[PDB]
């Protein structure tokens, strides 16, 4: 096979990153670990805090939008009822 | 054969075989495994004062040679001499372990000794990668347990150590009950036992050393990745068998099956090892060696290796582990036979060496645990007994689908995750 263009990701042994030195990682076999606890006592009061920060970024836009819809939605309802058959005939055509 | 052992006030053991010189030395049943994270490297620190220039000249004039050894399970201080000067030795051993237990530790010598091992250990961690990786293999395989302490001791706990620590250790460990004086070379048994019983006394008799907590294995890994290194050294093992174990030899024979290999030495590539077919097609590594490290509490069975083929490490491990799988399901008869012949061979060259300082370290360590040395002839009897069936049972307990310890340094980006390697410990079945 022929060569190919230079990508920004190789493969095991030459992944294309910076030379690493001084970093030492340690890990233990999943077999020597407690039969999957974590949640409740350690990672139960840690969760949801990961949507306490973000919450305002979603909520406000969702707020602004739900209000806008609900609001103009009520105006439709009014316009197409006796109470607004006059307002309607005005703002229609 | 020989090997004789007698008590007194202390316990003595000798093995004489008329050769050249003869060495006598005190071997203590405590070592690296009896240290703490913060006092670690104290024994390696004693080893260097005993071998200090100050003490070395005192024995050199007298015509003696000093040899010290620091291990996990034990410690040893040995003095070599001519066959006749067998008394010149004991008068030095005793002078340094009784009279000079106030000298030597004198500043100007301790500071000189300490600055020298602090460099000695700094050289080791910067250069001797294979042994460093192995040291870390113990470090993680037995982490937070006695066996996890590196013999040379850490570089930090070392520079915090002062004379007091040396003394405290000596007073707590160098004791009558936790010691064995040995004599190998050509010196007779009755010559030593009496020369020792000449000057009576005890020196801290009736005193026992502080005990601890039994060493244990843990499936884990430590990856000291260094991309600036030209190779990738890696060691990998499982929980082995401790000395004085039913399978002490069965386990040692299994390692001999896969043995050792040097890709550059023509004869090595011709060996009768099935694995060598898989590893030579794309030259997966420069070398590798299988071992069966045994100790008092536990052990490590696995292999070490160095490789320049950094992009195919995953296959080195793959093939190597697929072979280990064979010991549980398909190890052939001739594979076992070949192992015996080669086990006996390398086992013999170990015991039958032309250097008593080796023989001493072998006699001491054994009698310091089982209280007697197993005759080489007795070993061969056990080795030849071992059947294919034996190897499989051992592999079924020790090797098949068991946790593992991994350690590596250099370009190890290609060494896949723990779980990937761990998986290869077995094979699919119906």
In short:
This is part of a larger assembly, with chains A (93 residues) and B (430 residues). In chain A, 34% of the residues lie in helices and 5% in strands. Chain B folds into 2 domains: 201 residues, Cytochrome Bc1 Complex, Chain A, domain 1, CATH 3.30.830.10; 223 residues, Cytochrome Bc1 Complex, Chain A, domain 1 (2-Layer Sandwich).
Note down, in words, how this protein is organized.
- The structure is cut from a larger assembly and holds chains A (93 residues) and B (430 residues).
- Chain A has helices at residues 55-79, 85-91, and one strand spanning 24-28.
- By secondary structure, chain A is mainly α.
- Chain A has a single domain, classed as Cytochrome b-c1 complex subunit 8 (Single alpha-helices involved in coiled-coils or other helix-helix interfaces, Up-down Bundle), CATH 1.20.5.
- The N and C termini of chain A lie far apart (70 Å).
- Chain B has 2 domains: 1-201, Cytochrome Bc1 Complex, Chain A, domain 1 (2-Layer Sandwich); 208-430, Metalloenzyme, LuxS/M16 peptidase-like (Cytochrome Bc1 Complex, Chain A, domain 1, 2-Layer Sandwich).
- Chain B has helices at residues 43-50, 53-61, 86-96, 110-127, 129-141, 155-160, 163-173, 189-198, 248-258, 275-280, 313-329, 333-351, 356-367, 376-385, 388-398, 418-423, and strands at residues 4-6, 12-16, 22-28, 65-70, 75-81, 179-185, 220-225, 232-239, 260-262, 287-294, 299-307, 405-410.
- The chains are: A mainly alpha (93), B alpha+beta (430).
- Chain A binds chain B through residues 11-15, 19-21, 23-32, and chain B through 140, 218-228, 310-314, 403-404, 411, 413-414, 416, 418-419, 422.
